[PDB]
RNA sequence: GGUGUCUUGGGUG
């Protein structure tokens, strides 16, 4: 949940994100490049 | 007095350090957003560990 | 009714 990473406040209006939250970000994006290799061309040294 | 007292002038220095700047109480107040705990500083009016 | 996070350097006990 956001609680084991919450966000802070920089200058009155701006948030970063927690460092787990980015480094999810992180995984979803190569997750989803994942799953553009299986659904199509994908010569055996991008899959690895 | 039945001693008698070493007396005369010395030179002295005012330090930096003053009560005032280093007397903190707390009885609640903010706590952290991640661990819910008191918030550290004196400034900040947070708690002793 | 709600006053944010991490390091460097200098001190106090």
């Given at each position: 949940?956001?609680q084991?990473?919450?966000?802070?406040?920089?200058?009155?209006?701006?948030?970063?994100?927690?460092?787990?939250?980015?480094?999810?970000?992180?995984?979803?994006?190569?997750?989803?490049?994942?799953?553009?290799?299986?659904?199509d061309?994908?010569?055996?040294?991008i899959?690895? | 007095?039945?001693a008698?007292?070493?007396?005369?002038?010395?030179?002295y220095?005012?330090?930096?350090?003053?009560?005032?700047?280093?007397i903190?109480?707390?009885?609640?107040?903010?706590?952290?957003?991640?661990?819910?705990?008191?918030?550290?500083?004196?400034?900040?009016?947070?708690?002793?560990?």
């Amino acid at each position: 949940p956001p609680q084991v990473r919450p966000s802070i406040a920089m200058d009155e209006t701006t948030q970063g994100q927690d460092d787990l939250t980015h480094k999810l970000s992180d995984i979803l994006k190569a997750n989803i490049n994942v799953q553009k290799l299986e659904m199509d061309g994908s010569p055996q040294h991008i899959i690895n | 007095l039945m001693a008698q007292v070493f007396f005369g002038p010395t030179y002295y220095q005012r330090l930096r350090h003053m009560v005032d700047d280093k007397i903190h109480a707390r009885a609640r107040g903010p706590v952290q957003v991640l661990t819910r705990q008191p918030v550290e500083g004196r400034s900040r009016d947070g708690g002793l560990r």
